[PDB]
């Protein structure tokens, strides 16, 4: 028997409607969309333009502002590096947050190795940036501000509209990484003052290996292409456009636009159920992030005095994720939980639950029951729990490392 | 997860504690440097110098819990000098630990040494 | 018991506390159910008692007695 | 149109209960039930006609995906036991 | 009604040109032997009339239309002072304007081939 | 009725075996291969490693030397820019040919914009480079030599093994673009002394939007990553690895390894048939490229006094390709045909025929018959043909341009 | 094994002729006929058994792909007229 | 391909040639600057100054062939002054030519002008 | 004519010049064909004359006369 899937922040299953839309182009319509001389190419091009319009309609953009990529990693690279390199002659400063995704953070680090100056904005305990700090951090030579819409690890929502208003007033390009937000919360590029936006296909029940970046046409934002070649995608992303993948992305965007309100209502109900049932039975469990600015589909909880990987091993029948360093290939601690001020041992105790379009109340209840039983067992095994029961403060211990 | 680690995790051996006060019990509480794993190992030594009982409590990953359990039963039955010969390489070789989990075997060896040192420290006039 | 299982599914499908399902209670008037609920109750009956109720026979199933009679006869 | 709507609802439910995968099966059943109950009080025949046509398209999608998922099937989930 | 402009070619050579008001920059460059490609002949399809405009005159041009902006997206080595030479018309405000030719165009000529004048 | 497909160089249809291999991961095994903590991730990771071994087995490499990408465009960018940037502190010179693909050529051009020196080697009239010219062109500060295995437009084969031997003797990294060669002619990275190689999925009957790059481990070749992120693919290509796409690529490589000899024998027969039947019925038809070093699946013919786009429009029932400038979005003439010394009017008259794994003798003869009839019709329309029939030399004409 | 091989050959040909796409249909028919004629003189029973197992796997693939291509079918080619 | 262009390419009008040694026939042979398209348009002018016959031969793309055919059919029936008023904008508007195919309409107008100038030169003492 | 069409496909399927096809010529001995060729000939007969020849009847079709008799009878 196969375990339950509660890891939708990592990836999502393909929607059957999306697969149904894709299959004709994997069977019969296999032509190159860039072939200008025959009907295979013409039909592939028409399907690709249909998908472009679907994505643009989902985010409230003109279709000409959508560029297809291989994923949100490529989209983030294009946004950050292309903007920074294109305006290099006058602007040398970039702004982002300490809680951004690794692709954004690594692009900024490699730009710092390229001579740029980068400011990493701190966040409050709630996981939200301070608009006063951003406004004070903007320099006359600032090129780009990058703040993600929904955090992939704790699910906090940044004030995107306020940030965009500030950036527009200061004449700074505003980019947002919306990989975890598209098709889940409302987005409007013109209402928000967004200049660039990253989109990922497999976070919205579309295919893996495809993404898109929104680039504003009025007033025109320019980027310097990272992938050289024949000039596909308005000269900004060379290479053959994968027609089945982009058709699937467009179909997924249309489905999300049709399903968002219902999905959000269902997920909010399920999330409150999970959180209340966990908290009503387990003491010393804390949610990471502020409930007031939270996307209910991403629930990050800390189980005090229990190590996250050991809890995951105990939950062999549920697919989950943890922020513990022992689940990292390089023993990397969770920088997001460090940034929001979580103490280190609690950060080692964090578990991420994902609730999406296909999650059932049956699965939620099963997960809650298994978590309760296994946290009780591991706390009975925990020396930290024993010491806390004995009144010995954990901060005062003189641990003998080596 | 390797099946040996899974066995030790799902059927841990000698989980509990021993009366810290007793003359013939040493307690070893150690922590890992680059992660949050914490190990507490307690042993009981008889009049002959043989270890008759051992217990552990581990806050850490499944490999850490397996290393702690394996170290306990390995420690049961030996003397202090023999238990001083249990290196981390042996623990890791038995559990088939990958390079990223070697901190578990290192911490288990540290816990064993800490418990043995605590015991004679208690056995000093 | 056949009619015991029939009443059990009717009660589970309609939410009537397993006490209002009598031998003369109708699905629409007495019990609280619309046409969609009736469709689903018929399908649930088909699933428990393995069979394929035709449309004509399904339309005649408006009461617990009708369901019991169909299941017992077939 | 009441008989046509009931027949379409019955066909959608019966074909959706044949999904091999648990997530797709549960989702399709819930979604069909919620949508038909949501549109229970519509009055405009044009809107009813549009909803019916959309439901026929959805039934076609469900049929094809059910057959494909039966062709490529895996083990059941732990909760189905 | 005489407009004096300067073309800077790929080698760096500076070519004074005595143009006229109402002139087209691409045709005016081709009449004076400046190797500006201009393949589609001011039809806004090729982007090979791409030029750099000197900063003291860039803001004096009419702002580009979005059709020009779309064609400029296809031009390699795009800069903030990039314009399509076939869309620029000479006015007295453009006295002293300098047009520097980019090193490459949209069309590939890595062998060194230079297209014949259009 | 739909037209016949003879445009395999542009893209290929998906092999049904490849689609059969892909579908389970589009339906049930949808997990993220980088998820280290649950069974969905473990099974995705195992499938990915299986595909990596399949590709490595096809090219004769160790599996650890294969890095999955989004296509041969990305692979070429990674090879050229990564090697050049990594060895930037000592080596500043790159060597390639005038007939390379646009991704390679544009990468070299953009490198020329950041300070590197690039030499574009000429080719002989046969399309084959001169080894003496390459040996004379190698400098002490030369970093990389890039020559494609099979040309996409005329189908000539370069002496890859000899080039690799020369590069090894001179301590210069040798890269080859093998997008049109993999799974069609034998390839061995160690026998040919190749250091880097580009691979494309949709040129070998695999899915679009996926590719691979071979990077030699002994002695180690280093590249500087172009896509920043979480460190996937041994740090050289960050981003989520698209498990269905890489599984399809691996399945396609396995099928190609099993079918190559049979496919080559049939393709060679069909190509000989097409060429002989065209030449025995039409005067003044010349083949571009040398038959002695040619891949039979890519046939480039010039039909004198007939414009290529007009011929393509006459063949409305066959999907083909042409080198004519009137088929270009920017009126670009064919630089490959310019490089091999084809006179322009003939270069404007060139047609590319593709013969692949699924081409039939029925389709070939239909194409030949339609070509004969329509070339006769267009020559009866041709003023150049009339002037030639009247003995007026075309070179001596004083054409009135404007 | 001769009757088993002949029955397998008949089944493969019969199902491959049901391909909706012209390219797949012609390729499958020609490939089966060439491979069976290629292995007409093999003698090792181990090799024959291996080939037969491969052919059964291939027949399964052909069945699934034929059904899927019948679910998603397009117009005929100009030469099929 | 736009259907008007397809119709003109499918069924061209007045493909052929005329005796260019005759007094009342002008021949215009022109070529495109950025590509290989070549047009030859010939016209026949009667005693009244009206164009009675026109022919063309084109080496070029389908849009170029359509432009030449449309130019022949528009040139038949007019006078020299009327024929001098046909513009590449009109040709492109009728054939719905995209921007990349405007060289075809330009070449068709150039061919009309070349033929008319050739006839006028032949009609000079 | 039924047997004319039978002889036509036999000739097309075996490559015998449409003159070696007779009423007593065997497929294996007289004409040049193996068991795979016989399988394909039977399938071609099935296609032209729409039918489903069973295995027992297909094994009896070793001669042109047998094919003609089966097609005429069915
Ligand atoms: P009963 O007492 O007759 O009452 C029920 C009905 C609807 C028949 C009755 O109330 C009625 O006739 N009302 C008039 C309005 C009406 O007909 N409503 C229903 C319109 S049709 C409709 O709502 C279709 C919804 C389709 C949802 C498809 C979901 C697909 C999900 C796919 C997942 C992969
Ligand atoms: P006839 O006189 O009976 O002779 C024919 C046979 C094969 C029955 C006889 O010669 C014999 O028994 N020979 C012994 C060896 C033998 O059995 N050969 C055949 C072995 S099975 C075989 O070759 C399977 C080939 C499978 C091809 C698969 C093609 C898949 C195509 C896929 C397209 C997507
Ligand atoms: S000339 Fe083609 S765009 Fe200016
Ligand atoms: Fe650990
Ligand atoms: Fe043209």
Numbering used by the authors:
A (entry chain E), F (entry chain A): 56 to 457
B (entry chain H), H (entry chain D): 35 to 159
C (entry chain G), I (entry chain C): 3 to 76
D (entry chain F), G (entry chain B): 5 to 85
E (entry chain I): 69 to 186
Share the article's original sentences.
The process is initiated by the mitochondrial core ISC complex, which synthesizes a [2Fe-2S] cluster de novo from cysteine-derived sulfur and ferrous iron (Fe2+). This complex is composed of the iron-sulfur scaffold protein ISCU2, the dimeric pyridoxal phosphate (PLP)-dependent cysteine desulfurase subcomplex NFS1-ISD11-ACP1, the allosteric regulator frataxin (FXN), and the electron donor ferredoxin-2 (FDX2), which is itself reduced by the NADPH-dependent ferredoxin reductase (FDXR). The sulfane sulfur (S0) of the persulfide on ISCU2 is reduced to sulfide (S2-) by FDX2 to initiate [2Fe-2S] cluster formation. FDX2 and FXN compete for binding to overlapping sites at the core ISC complex during de novo [2Fe-2S] cluster biosynthesis.
